[PDB]
Amino acid sequence: ERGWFDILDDWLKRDRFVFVGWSGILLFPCAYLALGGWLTGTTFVTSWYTHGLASSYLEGCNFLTVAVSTPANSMGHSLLLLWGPEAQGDFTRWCQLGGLWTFIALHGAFGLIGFMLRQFEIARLVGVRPYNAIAFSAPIAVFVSVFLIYPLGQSSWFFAPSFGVAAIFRFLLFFQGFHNWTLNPFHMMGVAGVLGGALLCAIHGATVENTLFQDGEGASTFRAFNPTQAEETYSMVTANRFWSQIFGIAFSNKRWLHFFMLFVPVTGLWMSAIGVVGLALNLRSYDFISQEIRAAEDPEFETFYTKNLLLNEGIRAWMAPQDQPHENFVFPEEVLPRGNAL
């Protein structure tokens, strides 16, 4: 068996500086177009006709404020293809209608698929187990739930996150004010997985570096390691005693330790994804009913929970007219919620 397919497979799997692979055929153009689309938009392209915002270096934005913004709410969930019925093949109009947003979201999605396929392909060639790809399932679930499922549940792509620093900050604040997203136990598990993962990263790196064996004469200890060496470079036994005596418990099994390092942040991200799927439908953890019944009846009952809801109400009333221009909100001064003086 040495036909054109096998010859191609040979070329695709050459050991070169940048490995290609069959997965490369999907991954390279899609990742390139997504990145190039973002750079192109943030440098040159407005959001005047979709959002009423300037969004590019060309208009005077900086790195923090540039974005490729979502299409107008009136576009619905249009794929907004360049040759589609909205832009009708007109590149300029396509940019003005927000076509770069779906360009980037879709090429980005297919590129992420390509990258996970790359993780599988390389693992298979090299003869290792595919846990890196498996762990990548968490980035996939986040991207798909946030940039795709979420706006698909809402009225249109307009409410997806826009690709920009400040734009993303706005997304966070929208979620606080409208969804009370910090109250959601799926977000809370996400937070624990992220902060716990960061904790594990720090503590494991630090522990290894402070239980090193002296394997050289240098006071800078990095050179006293050889990639081909059979011996552990640090003492698990000493590490175990230290942590047992400091914290009460300690790892004793290195395999379990590293598995756990995969488990914690990967599971956290998956949990946050589930919460966002509910938010696509406005299925929020917004309230505690018992709290509201009590507070409604008793004007002296106050908790941090009720205090945060008043903040959410402020966010909604003060941000909506400019953040949701298609609604044509006109909120007269007298109806705006405000405490004393401010």
Binding site: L53, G205, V237, M261, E300
Partner: protein
Amino acid sequence: ANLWERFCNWVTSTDNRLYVGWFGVIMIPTLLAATICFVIAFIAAPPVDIDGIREPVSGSLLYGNNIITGAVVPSSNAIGLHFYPIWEAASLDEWLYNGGPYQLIIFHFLLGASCYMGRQWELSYRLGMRPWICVAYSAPLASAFAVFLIYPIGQGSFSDGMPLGISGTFNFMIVFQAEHNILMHPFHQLGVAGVFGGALFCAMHGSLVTSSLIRETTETESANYGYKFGQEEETYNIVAAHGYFGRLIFQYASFNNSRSLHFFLAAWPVVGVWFAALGISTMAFNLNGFNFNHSVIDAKGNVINTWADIINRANLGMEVMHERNAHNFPLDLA
């Protein structure tokens, strides 16, 4: 050996199930006091006039809270930074109304946790280890100091310290955003790179090591039984893990040195969290996030909004609503 020597030997002993040590001598009573007060208060404390306007906020389970809404509530704005121990109050009922437990707990806790850091140094010394795990722990510790002590000092009141509760924590974050535009501050941004990055590298390292485990078991048993505590040989093949990751990106983007790799795993989240802490600690003195409100203007002079201005509208909502009965004059100056 005299009694003082014997005592010293026991205190500093490497054979105790939990290490005590001189830092531990301060750590143990202080943490016990903060813990016991916290538990009792979280369950049973009456409402606390956090903002000094005779508007008591209920934080305890027995007074209408669940786990998510419950908190130990910061001491009164009328107190400010004044030291308010039990013995400064005419009565326990007074002490509780004014938020005395918050101060007792945060002070004992900050002292105890500082001592926890010292104790990590100390045990490392008793065992012949290198000393810097405690430096790693300085990052979360500095963060605690920032929200419980430095922010209050800068703003002039422990009423603005982070509440000891889940929803209270969220409250602290939202008001902080209204007042300092923390999302647009580069130190918080480095913080986020620090924790996202930490989680990423945690997963990455976990996955690479797990992927290169050397076969030592059968299909019907956990692969974890392939490692035995204290065995001299490494349990995974770093050469294979590096062959993999090096081909995933390119060769020179991957670590071949386990020591450099682990130092990176330490340094990335620790440094990023150091900046997170410094963010809060400097916004404590009102050096705030970037302000690009109305930065973009057209030829006539019309304001052209950017995403920064939408952020600004959100922040205005938070600002005008927070502590709705506490401001009498137009500017919220702390």
